[PDB]
Symmetry: D2
Subunit: 335 residues, 4 copies
């Protein structure tokens, strides 16, 4: 299958084209520490043959968590514990990625120091965010850098910057949430500035031979917000600094959209073609058939599975055509 073809990005070789999409498990301590639940959860999909396991949103500051049961990488003590996830997944044959995240105004911890580009709530249940100063923005850029340094110490192969789903970076990118009139607002170049500074600071702290991904929301599904043309312009600003765009949509504000298998694939293909950059496709993909169509028609370079890998952790094993491709311990169960 084309899904079984390797993809080399810088010095990292991913053995197949399936990525486990980053999915929060809301199972960490309030100190952001992983536990045996995470270790088993990720190892299971490594065992199941996933090429690239992207760890769930891991907060670069405590106020950048979504919930107070999220994973963190805002301090050095978290490194030794996250390394346990990295080591077991790599031992079982996966490339390990980490999604570096900051929830911004969508931080749902009522007691946290919630921040954003402009003082507008994510919704009625949320705390009003403090409007960030330029000084504070610089400190958050620094925090992404330190998180990348820690990720490298923990042994992650790939870093992803979470610029999607209504969180901090997306909030700067969208005119619907960014009403700033300083150097981080108004013009498209200014709205992109925070993302660009984060990328630059991550690269200062990330080995040049390891890849950087960026996850984006390619559509806000709302007049005056991000649309595919706007996202194409943003990706063109950063394509010389990052390796692959993990293409999603939505999350900034509540919107009813049409959901169906592959509903975000056109965004992935459009970015891939217009920007000439590698992309990942995600969204209601569950079958080998659709995954193969996406890859073979060159609509994306990787296929990300989220919910399908929650219910069906060995999806990739079931696509193999010989028992020798299975874990030796499970060879006898090949059909």
């Amino acid at each position: 299958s084309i899904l079984h073809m390797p993809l080399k990005i810088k010095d990292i070789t991913i053995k197949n084209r399936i990525m486990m999409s980053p999915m929060c498990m809301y199972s960490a301590s309030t100190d952001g520490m992983p536990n045996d639940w995470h270790i088993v959860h990720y190892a299971t999909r490594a065992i199941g043959g996933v090429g690239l396991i992207m760890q769930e949103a891991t907060a670069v500051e405590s106020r950048g968590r979504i919930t107070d049961h999220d994973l963190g990488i805002w301090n050095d003590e978290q490194v030794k514990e996250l390394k346990k996830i990295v080591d077991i997944c790599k031992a079982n044959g996966a490339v390990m990625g980490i999604q570096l995240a900051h929830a911004g105004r969508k931080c749902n911890i009522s007691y946290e120091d919630v921040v954003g580009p402009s003082p507008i709530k994510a919704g009625d249940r949320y705390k009003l965010p403090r409007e960030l100063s330029v000084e504070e923005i610089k400190s958050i850029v620094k925090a992404f850098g330190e998180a990348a340094k820690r990720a490298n110490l923990a042994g992650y192969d790939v870093v992803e910057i979470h610029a999607a789903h209504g969180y901090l970076i997306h909030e700067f990118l969208s005119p619907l949430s960014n009403k700033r009139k300083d150097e981080y607002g108004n013009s498209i170049e200014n709205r992109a500035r925070f993302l660009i500074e984060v990328i630059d600071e991550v690269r200062k702290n990330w080995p040049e031979n390891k890849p950087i991904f960026v996850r984006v929301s390619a559509d806000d599904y709302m007049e005056g917000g991000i649309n595919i043309d706007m996202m194409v312009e943003y990706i063109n600003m950063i394509k010389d600094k990052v390796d692959l765009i993990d293409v999603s949509s939505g999350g900034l504000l509540n919107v009813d959209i049409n959901l169906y298998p592959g509903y975000q694939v056109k965004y992935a293909e459009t970015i891939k073609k217009r920007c000439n950059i590698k992309t990942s496709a995600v969204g209601l993909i569950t079958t080998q058939e659709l995954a193969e169509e996406i890859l073979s028609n060159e609509r994306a370079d990787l296929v990300a599975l989220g919910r399908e890998l929650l219910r069906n952790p060995y999806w990739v094993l079931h696509t193999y055509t010989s028992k020798e491709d299975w874990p030796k311990q499970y060879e006898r169960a090949f059909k």
Copy 2:
């Protein structure tokens, strides 16, 4: 499901977006007559919920058969027998189409008059075809007209002209097979002439309120042959005369191509968008998931299933979410 949305074309309403792709059954007598095998074969998929059943290649001249077990519509006697297929499929809720065909140089009958645009074999296992005179070309154009007249008398709802898969019309369209220096060759307008004349003659013999489809091969997969750019030009020449392009590829000469699910879908989408015409997609589509993605992402207007409907004739019924959508006799078998 989007699959269950009707499609109206002229006065004909297809109840859903699934077409049974035309597939030769090689089960007729040497007289080209259908028999109980064909009647059951097609009726089964009408019962199974298929929106549009496209009858297999039905030869407009005896020398236009692929084999001497193909269906024919080259005489008036065949009409009464074909009507039996039409009536039973319509009785069971399907729209009935007929693929009007001429195999040209790919006719495999030893005792037939094998003809083509130029004296060039389809491959080293085929007969050298006899080069058609302009008078003979007019006679075949006439034969397509008479075939459409007969199809209307038999009660078909849709006619499809078979201009694909390396058969006669495709042979005129491709520079690899058409070496003529008269008005039927040596320019793109001249190579299109036969197709255009066939369409015009069919229209003279086909009610204005019934659709005309054309099946094409959008790619020869060979330098100098048809490619997507060339097929867009051909479709632009005919799009004001026909209702839907049934998009396929290959067949002209033996070529090794990459086969995978949806390997012809990009041609279908490309023709739909560049020519602003309805299209059907076909080729290794077997899942509801991929069918839904194709329709929802506006890559085609109909999804054609071939081999899946041979092995799984009730595929459409399995997509229904209510017992009242099933044939009353089988209601007790719903989930």
Copy 3:
């Protein structure tokens, strides 16, 4: 698969162990005649690879129909139309069976002569049946024989006597519905008399080298009714005269029944072992896996599929491991 092993019964060889269970389609006209709907319906499962297609309940008298859209074989004019079903199914590789039936007190036609062993309704919605005389019982026996004669003329390979599902013969077999005090009631031998007579009259009209099946309800799920031990007794009375027992349950009266895959298989196994006779198992079987277990554990000789073959007509084709087992027209889809 054991599913693919032939079964020879008298001179008829069934190419595999899958039977299409008899299922009413309510698609005939009031004349009892089949039409193109039936022809396509059965032909489809023959193309789908079913070893033995058992045609739906086909009434041996017009008053023996369940509905007035049932198939009939109570007159000679029906033979040439039923033959159309037989010929196309055999042409496509299936052994063809017919379920000879009589609805008795469960006849749902308001204007028919609804008859039964005793004047007791099947339920609130049913007509009070007219209590049969001995002469009338003999006439119905004769009707079964004539129906078998017609079935042979139409070319059926197998005849099945429908002695189940609360219909006429079952009504004679169950103490719950048979309160007669003549030679057709009041002892197990007398309750079996009608069935035995029907079998004998069928044998006089059916070639000795073609199989006879009998479908039975092995449990009424009610105190005083048929139970597995009683059915074993009945089967031992007829086993020297028939070839296979098609084992089902229920239908005489409304009862709550626990439903699950294989819920009637224990009845099939018990009759098979305790009577030393071939059996078929039916009821909520949908998987190759369970079909194989039933056959390989010698719980039955055939597995009957009903609803699974309505929704999934090519079930058998999907069990083949080579394209040569498929219809040649469809080989490309293997």
Copy 4:
């Protein structure tokens, strides 16, 4: 489903009727220690909703291993590590069992002290076992007792005595392998003596409120060996001392057995009915349909899955009809 009904045995409640059959993973050290591969392996099936996880054959002494990558429980160091498996499986909702084993003459370790009841090989590739003295038999009985003591310290809920598959206890039970003329041979009561002594010693070391299972081979498939009637006799000797018979077959000598789904179910039903004891069925069972048939027709009290749980670890989750039955982390994947 009937498979979702709890089964309470003594003070232990199994939440459903699915057992993970004991399966060697050949992944331990030569010191018989488990490692992270075992912990994840078993935990995965606990997460997957399995009611009772039966750990693989765990050797009561080193010469009782099948291979030198088997788990052992002959010392405290092993207990400390096995406890990690128990704890994570119980934390995720499973009852944890351990299969206490001794390979006897089928010990396949080239350097071990291979023992059996009589000096007869299991097959040409095996070593000739040395005939145990009555004193040595008593010491192996004591080893089973100490193993049960250790298993209780590790926190296992259920202890299973492995008396099947051609291993030590089975070798004493079968006339084909037991040619002894002392009190451990000849008569059926003497053949049963070792099994009976092992059960008695386990009971001295195992809490009275925790279940004891026994796995047996109910057929040797050879004239003069064990058959179902003989096994019924043995179970009648022990049924007042144990809680459930885990019914299997074969293993003593190589025999060409007819393999098919449910091929051992008749043995489980017969023991259940004739002995009035609970049983589990195992062997080529993969479908919900067959599992439900087995339980509903009262052929067994538990259904054990082996290879199906290797390839499809979340089998039980897929049977649930409500999202609330899923682990909370995965409830978004309920479909």
